[PDB]
Amino acid sequence: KDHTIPLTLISILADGEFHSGEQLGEQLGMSRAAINKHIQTLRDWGVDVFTVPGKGYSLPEPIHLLDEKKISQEIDHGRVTVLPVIDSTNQYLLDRLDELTSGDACVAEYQQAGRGRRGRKWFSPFGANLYLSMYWRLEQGPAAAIGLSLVIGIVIAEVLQQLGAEQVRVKWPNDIYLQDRKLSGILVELTGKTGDAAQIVSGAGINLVMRQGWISLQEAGVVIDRNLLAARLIKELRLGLELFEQEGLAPYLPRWEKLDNFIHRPVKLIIGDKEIYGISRGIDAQGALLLEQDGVIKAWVGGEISLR
Amino acid sequence: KDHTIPLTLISILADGEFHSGEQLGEQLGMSRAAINKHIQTLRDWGVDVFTVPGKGYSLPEPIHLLDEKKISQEIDHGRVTVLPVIDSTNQYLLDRLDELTSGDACVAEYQQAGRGRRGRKWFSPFGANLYLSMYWRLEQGPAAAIGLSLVIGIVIAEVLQQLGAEQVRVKWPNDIYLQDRKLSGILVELTGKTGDAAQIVSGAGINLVMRGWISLQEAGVVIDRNLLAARLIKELRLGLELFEQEGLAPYLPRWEKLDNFIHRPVKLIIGDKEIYGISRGIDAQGALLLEQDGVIKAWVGGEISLR
Ligand SMILES: O=C(O)CCCC[C@@H]1SC[C@@H]2NC(=O)N[C@@H]21
Ligand SMILES: O=C(O)CCCC[C@@H]1SC[C@@H]2NC(=O)N[C@@H]21
């Protein structure tokens, strides 16, 4: 049944402040007697309404109304948007940083300008692979994005493992590997201030279809509906990040050890155009890379790990 | 830029079947030459399209497109609907049983015809208390709804405990209590077949404001209604799915900590009958264990009251 007028009426009084029959009549476009009549319906609904005689109405105390969007977000800790065509899922969230909350996600079917790490281009054919991005605000500094990327790699690799691909491994600071071949590229981008929060948009591109250095989930004997895989990743990533927010990197230290593709192996550390050679010894308790050169282990807080 | 036509083209070709430029022109309302040109736009997007003379265009293999509702459904296992005015949240779900999946929920601000267990009426004033309902299909029989109700009671009391009401207790088979006063009424209704599944719509009305009954306001506990509803729906979905795969075993110790009437003189009411004894909790299948004259017997029905 149409209850539009009483429902609009209660939303104007939900603040608990004083509301005059004249102002109500202006907003609702109704007479003062009819405004009173629709106040009368509300009291028949069990709403306590105070009637100041001749001046207007007020609620005893402010009331907060039910909202689908508010309820869903607390259920979800984030929204999801599907884009058929976009330049990049990372760029879509980056363009809307002022309006995002931690957990907001974004999946695309086709990326017109998918981006890699070093200015590389991510080939994103329509409806073939997964092109996902999610936003997260870290109250810790921009240096917390290292743990961000490490947690993301652990979560993504774990989710793939529960779906069949038991030999999926991670790469410091962000990539997913399988049989020493790149299966998914992660691109974590950040704008922040030291001593303050950091807004992070992380984007994952997972090779699902085959089309020497690259591998696909099809080549692993794993076939998944993209909607199911995307939903599982968004759900698990959201849970992993809030755990990282409240407990830090400590829960993920044993998990990184089980998943590191390059631990105790000869690797290449890439910073700028430099190339540092050594044996990887995992990560430290703060997510810094532990790289052994000539028997000496030094901690690195930046760069990329490569194969040798 | 407008990408409607290439996107409509790919949704028409996503089946993997053959589609002739004539058929495409009919659906797309476009010429045959322009259809061919926009086929090329799809190929510039990395879509494999075969141009077979005399048969049509086709994708090499059927492709499955991304859907927001499908993705959201797996993230949530259930949707949520807020209704400003409705007769009953239980009735809303019951009217739509053919379209519901386990976890679908329903919150109302005002219920015109609130419903109790034995046909009494739940007074549901607008924007005062929580009027929530959820659907669930149990693959086990209708007798599994007793464990359903027990899990629902445990979850709701647990959620309330984490929000401040640390002394909230449960009642067999379904009610929420506080200081031996009714704090929330649960109405679990079901339709099923023995030896088959049962569709269950459970509805909880939680007294939040003061107007034998107790409210969360009277306990010094204030919760945002949006926050309480969201937490309940999440925990109920998680709790019910755990019950689906592990049974009542995880909840047996949890029920004991929350039973308001265990080891107390109680009244078992079935119909107009009154059976007297001391409650000794529940069994592993959710049946009430009632001690009368030193003998503990399991009951599969009725309501527990106080004496
Ligand atoms: O290997 C790399 O350098 C990172 C590649 C990241 C690719 C994904 S596709 C989803 C998201 N959107 C982008 O533009 N990039 C990432
Ligand atoms: O104590 C009882 O007999 C059960 C009361 C159940 C009340 C709730 S309010 C939400 C849902 N909608 C209804 O009509 N009833 C339940």
From TrEMBL, chain B:
Keyword check for Transcription: yes
Any Pfam family matching the protein: BPL_C
SUPFAM superfamilies, alphabetized: C-terminal domain of transcriptional repressors, Class II aaRS and biotin synthetases, Winged helix' DNA-binding domain
MF (Gene Ontology): ATP binding; biotin--[biotin carboxyl-carrier protein] ligase activity; DNA binding
Superkingdom of origin organism: Bacteria
Coiled-coil region(s): none
One GO biological process term: regulation of DNA-templated transcription
Ligand binding (biotin): 88-90, 111, 115-117, 182
Family: Belongs to the biotin--protein ligase family.
Protein name per UniProt: Bifunctional ligase/repressor BirA
Provenance organism: Klebsiella pneumoniae
Gene (UniProt): birA
